């Protein structure tokens, strides 16, 4: 009934030196925790407004619902997209799809990096699956706007480019963070999400 | 709760020649009716998504909720803002507030006309009440985004500047529609809404 903060699947320092433990602890225990609690508060308000047929109240709650709900959706995926066992390249059908849709794994990395570096302000870069077209697709999302809820694409790999995802360690140089994060991508998880899209 | 299309407070031809009967009938029985019908469908989908804790579905439903819910809110106010007995100027505290906040009734008309003419695409011009500042305020809203739900201002008088509000009669010449609508403003209703803010 109530959304809950998932435990991080590894130690706060498991991704060093690529993402330091201070970032991981703040990002999970402060940023994500606030989204979950605030999401539950917003949902309860929305349920009351819906039962009363208060459309003005429903609409006034939309920014908080998308922001906190998206924050919960995005970070819950993000933690599983990273791993101390990550990095390198995927294999199997996901690697084949990457080569087919983007030319090569390196070209895909460049395209997702470009989308992630190109976010002006806060947001996310995504590798997604387009169910209707049956192929991979890159998109960027502002703030906490979640991929599937706002575009219909199924999320496979998300790169958080909010400043809190990198600033303590990499300061203003977002490209240094993007270079580092490729070393911890949990391709086992991305592959699982991809295979779940195909039937 | 099931939303319902409110009866129009007058005959479809009651606002002639300023807004013709064909427009009024289409606007109420087709456009507003569709907002009500689609709002009810969207609200039911939201009830299902809330019970399942499906945040992705909640967020995917937001555009339809704001569009149809806002359409229902906006048009329900709009019908009461007009009258066959309308036109002229308000009196009492509303006229005093208009003179105080905009300089004169004529200057207020210029400002609300300008905000309404300035909408690029579909939208609405509004005279609202700012509860925190305790004074009147003009704002424009895109599409069916409702005034109170998106800005907190209490709606007093709305001018629909979607093309369906005027096109059959005035074609591309939105300024002619804006000049004509002043002849049917129900200042009695605007006054009631204004006095309800100070009460
Ligand atoms: K360590
Ligand atoms: Mn984040
Ligand atoms: Mn309309």
| Experimental resolution (Å) | 1.4
Encoding tokens for residue A64? 């908080």
Which of chain B's residues have a Cβ under 8 Å away from the Cβ of A60? 148-150, 152
B155: contact with A, CB 8 A cutoff: no
Q: How far is A149 from chain B (nearest CA, A)?
A: 4
Ligand nearest to the CA of A24: 2
Residue A31 annotated as part of some ligand binding site: no
Report the candidate in B195, B160, B193, B184 with the shortest Cα–Cα distance to residue B9. Answer: B184
3-state class (DSSP) for residue B185: strand
Cα gap A40→A42, rounded to integer Å: 5
Cα gap B153→B137, rounded to integer Å: 8
Report the candidate in A8, A28, A6 with the shortest Cα–Cα distance to residue A164. Answer: A28
List chain A gaps (C–N > 2.5 A) by preceding residue. none
**Number of neighbouring beta carbons within 10 Å of residue A22:** 12
**Number of neighbouring beta carbons within 10 Å of residue A148:** 20
**Cα A44–A47–A52 angle (5° rounding)?**
130
- Mutation choice for A interface testing from B45, B53, B56 by most A CBs within 10 A: B56
B162: CA distance to ligand 2 center in Å? 39
Q: How many CA atoms lie within 13 A of A102 on its CB side?
A: 19
B15: CA distance to ligand 3 center in Å? 15
A86: CA distance to ligand 2 center in Å? 19
> Is B73–A53 a contact, with Cβ atoms under 8 angstroms apart?
no
Tell me if A86 sits within 8 A of A181, measured CB to CB. no
A20: CA distance to ligand 1 center in Å? 9
A99: contact with B, CB 8 A cutoff: no
Cα gap B171→B163, rounded to integer Å: 8
What are the strands, taking DSSP E only, across chain B?
123-130, 135-142, 154-160
3-state secondary structure chain A: CCCCCCCCCCCCCCCCCCCCHHHHHHHHHHHHHHHHHHHHHHHHHHHHHHHCCCHHHHHHCHHHHHHHHHHHHHHHHHHHHECCCCCCCCCHHHHHHHHHHHCCHHHHHHHHHHHHHCCCCCEEEEEEEECCCCEEEEEEEECCCCHHHHHCCEEEEEEECCHHHCHHHHCCCHHHHHHHHHHHECHHHHHHHHHHHCC
**Number of neighbouring beta carbons within 10 Å of residue A52:** 11
Tell me if A90 sits within 8 A of A190, measured CB to CB. yes
> Is B62–A62 a contact, with Cβ atoms under 8 angstroms apart?
yes
Of the partner residues A47, A60, A62, the one whose CB lies closest to the CB of residue B50? A47
Which protein residues have a CB closer than 5 Å to ligand 2 (ion)? A 160, 162
What are phi and psi for residue A158, nearest 5 degrees?
-115, 140
Domains of chain A with bracketed CATH: 21-81 (1.10.287.990), 92-197 (3.55.40.20)
B4: contact with A, CB 8 A cutoff: no
Residue A4: closest C-alpha in chain B: B53
A128: contact with B, CB 8 A cutoff: no
Q: Experimental method used, please? A: X-ray
């Amino acid at each position: 009934m109530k959304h809950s903060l998932p435990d991080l699947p590894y130690d706060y320092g498991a991704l060093e030196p690529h993402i330091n433990a201070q970032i991981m602890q703040l990002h999970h225990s402060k940023h994500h925790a606030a989204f979950v609690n605030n999401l539950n508060v917003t949902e309860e308000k929305y349920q009351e407004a819906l039962a009363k047929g208060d459309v003005t109240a429903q609409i006034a709650l939309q920014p908080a619902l998308k922001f906190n709900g998206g924050g919960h959706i995005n970070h819950s995926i993000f933690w599983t997209n990273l791993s101390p066992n990550g990095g390198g390249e995927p294999k199997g059908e996901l690697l084949e799809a990457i080569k087919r849709d983007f030319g090569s794994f390196d070209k895909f990395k460049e395209k997702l990096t470009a989308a992630s570096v190109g976010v002006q302000g806060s947001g996310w870069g995504w590798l997604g699956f387009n169910k209707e077209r049956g192929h991979l697709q890159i998109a960027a999302c502002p703030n906490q706007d979640p991929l599937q809820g706002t575009t219909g694409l199924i999320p496979l790999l998300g790169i958080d480019v909010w400043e809190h995802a990198y600033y303590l360690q990499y300061k203003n140089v977002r490209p240094d963070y993007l270079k580092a994060i490729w070393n911890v991508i949990n391709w086992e998880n991305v592959t699982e999400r991809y295979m779940a899209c195909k039937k």
